[PDB]
Paper text:
Ryanodine Receptors (RyR) are intracellular ion channels that control release of Ca2+ from the endoplasmic and sarcoplasmic reticulum. RyRs form massive (~2.2 MDa) channels that are embedded within the membranes of the endoplasmic or sarcoplasmic reticulum (SR), where they control the release of Ca2+. They form homotetrameric assemblies, with the bulk of the protein exposed in the cytosol. Calcins are a family of scorpion-derived peptides that can penetrate cell membranes and bind to Ryanodine Receptors (RyRs) with high affinity and specificity. Upon engaging the RyR, calcins cause long-lived subconductance states, which are readily detected in single-channel recordings as decreased current levels at 20 to 60% of the full conductance.
To obtain higher-resolution insights into [name] binding, we collected a larger dataset for RyR1with [name] in the presence of a cocktail of activators, including 30 μM free Ca2+, 5 mM caffeine, and 8 mM adenosine triphosphate (ATP). Because [name] does not occupy the [name] binding site, and apoCaM stimulates channel opening, we also added CaM1234, a [name] mutant unable to bind Ca2+ (19). The presence of [name] on the fourfold symmetry axis results in a break of the fourfold symmetry, and we therefore processed all data without any symmetry imposed. In the global refined structure, the largest movement of S6ext is also observed for chain A (~4.2 Å). As this movement is primarily a tilt, movements far away from the hinge point are larger in magnitude. We observed that [name] can cause substantial conformational changes in the cytosolic shell, including asymmetric breaks close to the [name] binding site.
Numbering used by the authors:
A (entry chain E): 1 to 106
B (entry chain D): 3634 to 3681, 3693 to 3736, 3750 to 3862, 3871 to 3972
C (entry chain D): 244 to 318, 337 to 361, 371 to 426, 436 to 455, 465 to 499, 506 to 630
D (entry chain F): 1 to 56, 63 to 129, 135 to 148
E (entry chain D): 1648 to 1749, 1759 to 1787, 1796 to 1873, 1924 to 2014, 2020 to 2046, 2091 to 2216, 2222 to 2261, 2267 to 2369, ...
Write the structure that this text describes.
Amino acid sequence: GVEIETISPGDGRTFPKKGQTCVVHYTGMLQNGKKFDSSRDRNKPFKFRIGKQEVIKGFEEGAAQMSLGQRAKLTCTPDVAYGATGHPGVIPPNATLIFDVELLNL
Amino acid sequence: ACFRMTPLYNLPTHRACNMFLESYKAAWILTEDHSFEDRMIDDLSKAGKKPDPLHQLVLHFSRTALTEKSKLDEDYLYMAYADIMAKSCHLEEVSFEEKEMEKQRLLYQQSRLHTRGAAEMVLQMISACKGETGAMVSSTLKLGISILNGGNAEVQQKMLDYLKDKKEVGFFQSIQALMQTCSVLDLNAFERQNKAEGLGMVNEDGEKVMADDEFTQDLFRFLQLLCEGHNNDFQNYLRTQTGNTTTINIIICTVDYLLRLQESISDFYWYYSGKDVIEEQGKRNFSKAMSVAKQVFNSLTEYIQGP
Amino acid sequence: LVYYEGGAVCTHARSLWRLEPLRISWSGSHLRWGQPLRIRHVTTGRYLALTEDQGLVVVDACKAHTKATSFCFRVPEIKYGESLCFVQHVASGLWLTYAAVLKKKAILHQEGHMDDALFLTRCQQEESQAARMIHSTAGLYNQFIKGLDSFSGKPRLPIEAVILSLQDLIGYFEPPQSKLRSLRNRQSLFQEEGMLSLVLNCIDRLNVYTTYAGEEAAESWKEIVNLLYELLASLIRGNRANCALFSTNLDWVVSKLDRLEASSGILEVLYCVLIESPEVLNIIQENHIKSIISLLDKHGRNHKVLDVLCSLCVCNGVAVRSNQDLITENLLPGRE
Amino acid sequence: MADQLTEEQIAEFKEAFSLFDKDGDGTITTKALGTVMRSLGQNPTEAELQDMINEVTIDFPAFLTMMARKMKDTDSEEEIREAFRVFDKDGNGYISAAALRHVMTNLGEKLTDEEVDEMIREAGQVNYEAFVQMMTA
Amino acid sequence: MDILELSERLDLQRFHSHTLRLYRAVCALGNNRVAHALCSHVDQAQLLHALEDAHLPGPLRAGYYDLLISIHLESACRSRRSMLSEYIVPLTPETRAITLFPRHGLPGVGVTTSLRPPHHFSPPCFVAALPARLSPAIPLEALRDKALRMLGEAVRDGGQHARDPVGGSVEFQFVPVLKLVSTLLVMGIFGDEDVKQILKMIEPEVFTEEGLLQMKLPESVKLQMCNLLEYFCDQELQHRVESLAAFAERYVDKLQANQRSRYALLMRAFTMSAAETARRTREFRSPPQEQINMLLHFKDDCPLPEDIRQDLQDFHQDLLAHCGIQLPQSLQELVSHMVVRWAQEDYVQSPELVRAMFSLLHRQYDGLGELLRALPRAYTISPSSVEDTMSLLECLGQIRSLLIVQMGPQEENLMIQSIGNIMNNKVFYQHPNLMRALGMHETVMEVMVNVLGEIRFPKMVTSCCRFLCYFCRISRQNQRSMFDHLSYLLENSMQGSTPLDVAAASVIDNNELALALQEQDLEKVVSYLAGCGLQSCPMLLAKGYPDIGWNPCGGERYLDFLRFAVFVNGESVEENANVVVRLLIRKPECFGPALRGSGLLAAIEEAIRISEDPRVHLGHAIMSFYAALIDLLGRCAPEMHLIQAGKGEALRIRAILRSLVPLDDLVGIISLPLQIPVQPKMSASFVPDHKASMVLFLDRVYGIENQDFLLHVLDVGFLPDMRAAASLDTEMALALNRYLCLAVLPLITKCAP
């Protein structure tokens, strides 16, 4: 499944599983902890769409699992996120796609 | 179909604007006259050890031509500068004083454009041409006839010194292969041109023959100017290349070209013998061939001038 | 075998021949018609002799008999041999001619041909000295390779002479503009005579042994290998033929560079030939980039390997997809 | 191909082809293309459509070239009609030698006197039938 | 480990610089995926921090600045530079009112009419569902503001002349910033205010409303400043082109109105006789180019208004004043003084810098000359088709980028899709002028040269050949341009379209190109015909059939090209026909195997035998080749007027071609019937086109003059063909009817007397 570990608890009643686009400060961590992708690094929060499945299935499931307004360590197995191959250069093969996506709005 | 042609006042606007702009550019820009060439050469020549900007440019072009790339680039800036300078020195009844003053001014303009090393760049570029006709050769020949105008002795002496020091056989073979491939009169080409003229220029909304007539005229003018001044040493060098490993006899090849020209003109006359009336295109071709032969014969005089 | 050929052969060192008069004393005197002389190849060192079985062909110096090697020119009368000089054997009297990229074999015939006259062109003394030095170096390398094969199969050689020859050759081919043109011409002449092939064979023989000879004798073997690699690097620079040969043997060069010992020299040779020949990158396979990536992990961080990778990324003014993808998928995902 | 074709006609044909074939590869069959052209106001003859199908999966420029080749006869007929109208513009529908010279000068071809005399002889003043024959050429 | 602390290490800094160089090389020349990977590695924030940090190491800061533009805006800047050549100025109400003078205007200000394709930037993402690629997004306005602030800080530091340069040297302090600002300037990042501020910083006193140029700079900084000056000159040229387009639109509208009024007056007027002819000379009877030239002949008697002539003269004088040919506040004077001072200051050892500086100087003084050179590369597009022209420019830039990158697998598909989009683009066939000016023919020729160099990518070659042939069919000027490059197509030139087909398409549909054919092309085609002998078709070799001593496919293609070259507009050029028949007969190997052995009837019988024996059948190809050969032999025959005039050369050629092939063989070939019906397949049998070619050969060579001969030829072959057509009166029936109407009917009409 998707490992969930809260870091910045917040509101739990609101849920982004309605099926609308949500703005989240999504960041990615490698198997060894390297920050291969971060919203702060891009200097702009990432807009994630719920239901459209534009993002990876594992990433979308992790984002939907976390309720709106709370931040948690949404660690995802590489098999469901990007597979064994992963990104051609960003993600090395057989590297876990650890995520720390934080829900900001929508 | 002329009566059915699309009128100008009933046409798409963009096509009308483009056609009018093209016509205006052709009729004005080409006819437009700019004398900035002398302006620029002198202003950049102000030079106000440390080489002059003209000296730096000449050295840069000499270094570029010295490379054994076996090819010539476009060199648009080289075309621009060659046109600037060649026209510069080309700035060229009257009493003796006026003629002497004009000669002194021409000598000063040459020396301003000669001491920097223009003769060396001419020799290097001609050697690197490898007998390949094109705009490069025409530009360098124009620049040479500009620098060598008036039969300057210093330019010829420095050219002889450069030839002796370099001792490179490339220049002779290059010039031989270059002037060997010069086009002559062709009866097939003339008949093709006549048929094309009979087709009609107005149909479907210069001449292939003697296309390089001006090119050969300028080349033989440069060769005559090289032989100008009764410079016996240069005549001996051109006759036999004793210093060079391989000697190319320019006399034999220019005589062969003269033979080719005489054959072409004789065949032209034989074709035109039947028709008493000479056509306008035929008259123009005859005049161009006559001018080419006149330049060739003047060059031959300058070869044979002196004892 | 004597054979007249045109093209680049006339500009090679294999076409250089020296005429030695019959009398050793006053060998520098002017040549006269009918004077016996001996022709010896500068590059090969074998004097030409009119052997009965082989006709007109090069013969060994030890077997170069005076009668067999006695040659004369038939019309201080001629200048540099430019005049018609029919080659005739003194003992036999046969006229040298041809029998059959034009290349006709040279043989001796009783009657010959009406066009047997040949013109001789004088060569610079520097070129003759370079040819003699190249022949001497080739002989020394052949002797060294013979000794290497001799002691290769026996567990327990002029090392100093080989090192001195390598140093002299490196000084000859030391990069400094006519100097670059002269160096390129010297490298081309050396490659035409087979110096590059001999150097490659010596390098392979050295790489065969991982350590044989005496303890003191084998101490300088690493220095000899380094000198040979430096000579190969010097020959590769400013030589299109050397670059093409290295591109053809790119797999062997990569395998040699994969070795820990003297990896820097092989890497420099590979970089130089890749710069000289852009086609090496196109013909390169994934093993080359894999070895380049592993070099930093194993040998350590080095700017030379990264510069080689930069050269591999873009060559001939264009970007090749294969090498770019290999470099982006080999070390970039790891980020180590 | 369609160098002499009108720009408006070319644009209309391009729009019709794009509407008929959304893929842009010209997969519309000859019969379907003819039906679309007929629905666009240019009704194609059945015999002409059959001949075009027999002569001919082809991109739009090929269809434009085929249409221009088919309509070249119409262009020739229009040119002949224009020449007939120009000839009729003269006195009594007949162009004299002076009228022919003026027409040649207006056309810009700069026809010589010998050419004008030959044209007059082929067509002293020509008649209406002679002018029509000269225009037809 | 801080990056700043590695400056004095002398090893970590060098390694980091080498890593930056490797990243730049990987991201160089497109490679958007590798650029995105490099951005992910740098996290798109480290580069900004390094740029904003003045204490970063010199080489490291230079590498980061280079990577900032090499991995983000390199593709955009390359596309902008490629599209800068095409000065397309579509009509627009805002662009209709444009003036060169607002004193001289500032370069690179105001609305530009150039239809450069917009730069497309994709936001970087590394969490999307991974299954070409667009360039990664850039801060744009924020990046432009940061670059402007850095340039201002560098200018202030240079003015202060502090002994602590940024990065440890002046080169590291100024060169990367200048390169970055130039890269974003060629991409159009800055607006009017930002470029005005940049110009003021470069030279505040020159552009009134010290400087960077006044302050001493190294060779690289001087080269960057010269590049900036070249961009300013290009912007001034673009402004001149925009003003010229606006004046062209206004003057074209005025001339349309005046021409309509003049035509109405001429139609109303009838008394004038000579004046009527004079008006008709410039009227619609003349071609539009001739009318435009006549209306513009008042330079320095034409039927034009005096007021409009004076207005045009004043506009031309204003243009001359703007170019400053003949009258450092002026921009051209400023750059001229700058290059003169740089040349006279000291010797510059960089050839590129001095070459670029000299280019700018001649560029600056000769404003009119550049305008003339850029005049052909200028056109006005329709306002309605602005989107179509933008798509054209984007596709052309895509093809140019593909050509820049090395050809390889999974990349020819993008070029083929681009070519399909160009073909489907409306402006490609509507207006050939953009096609010629954009260099699309040059780009397709370059990519064809690259792929051909064994055909590695046959689909790419076929698509390129189809595009080139379509381009020649577009207009006659395209055909002439292809003729100018025809030598490469004849020298280089299996299956599908071939470059020789492009050459044939260039030759056809025009007598001017057909007449001017050079003898080298005929010699090459004759050599190819000779080489066709003692060979086999590649299709036949693939099928495993034994070689027949020649290749019907390539030989037939070459022969069809020859017949296209000789036969244009129905007539045949005497010189071309004579030379082609002479070169054909000089080598007997180019003819059929029967001709030297055997006869035409024997060849037909053999072809029928192979047809009976078990769309790549050999018999049909052999019959088609023989029919093409006889048709080509009869096509170059002298016309009726040549025979009537009794020309010696024409009579000799006719006699030679008549004796080459006997008439009885032609009658025997025609006498062979056809299986008119189930209907058979004409792709593997004797097509009626062969009979049509035979009849045309007989008519153009022998001719049926005697009544007995006409009756005999009507009875033999003609009568069975007519009977078969009547019985079958179906693809076979249509082919028979076409053959009858194309060959039998004209010959019957001619032989009716």
